[PDB]
């Protein structure tokens, strides 16, 4: 009965699209504002295209090229990548926030 519910509910297909896909996706400017604190020297402090700024940030973060894809208006990430970036961001700010 549990197997039949997992089958009709599409539970395994749902897990697979989370693992095989990119369920985390952030607009270039939001990615900058959230995570530029992780890599503050990575962008020359003048104006820059948000997409190119995100490319520079992701290179300075040295993320594996399979963990992300870059779109027309968003960066896409594998599951759990943004969780790690959030943990690292929280660590940097915890000194100032204390």
Partner 1 sequence: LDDLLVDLDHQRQSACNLEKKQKKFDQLLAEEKTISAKYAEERDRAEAE
Partner 2 sequence: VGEEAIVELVENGKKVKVNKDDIQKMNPPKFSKVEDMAELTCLNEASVL
Partner 3 sequence: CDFSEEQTAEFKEAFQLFDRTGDGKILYSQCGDVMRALGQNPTNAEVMKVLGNPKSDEMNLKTLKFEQFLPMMQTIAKNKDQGCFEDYVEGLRVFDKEGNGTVMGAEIRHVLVTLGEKMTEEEVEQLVAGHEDSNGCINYEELVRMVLSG
Please choose which of partner 2, partner 1, partner 3, none residue 66 contacts, taking the beta carbon within 5 to 8 angstroms, the exact cut-off set by kind. Answer: partner 1
Question: Residues with Cβ < 8 Å from 61, sequence gap 6 or more?
Answer: 35, 38, 39, 85
| CA 79 centroid distance within chain | 8
**Per-position x/- string for 60-79, each x denoting binding to partner 1 as judged by CB under 8 A, each - no binding:** --x-x-xx----------x-
What is the full DSSP assignment across 67-84? SEEE-SSEEEE-TTHHHH
From 8, 19, 87, 94, residue interacting with partner 2 (rule: CB under 8 A): 19
Please, which of residues 2-61 interact with partner 3 by CB under 8 A?
30, 33-34, 37
């Amino acid at each position: 009965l549990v197997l039949d519910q997992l089958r009709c509910n599409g539970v395994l297909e749902g897990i697979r699209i989370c693992r095989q896909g990119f369920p985390n996706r952030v607009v270039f400017q939001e990615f900058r504002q959230r995570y530029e604190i992780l890599t503050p020297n990575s962008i020359p402090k003048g104006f820059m295209d948000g997409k190119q700024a995100c490319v520079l940030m992701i290179k300075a973060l040295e993320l594996d090229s399979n963990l992300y894809r870059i779109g027309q208006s968003k960066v896409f990430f594998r599951a759990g990548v943004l969780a790690h970036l959030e943990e690292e961001r929280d660590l940097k700010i915890t000194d100032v926030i204390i």
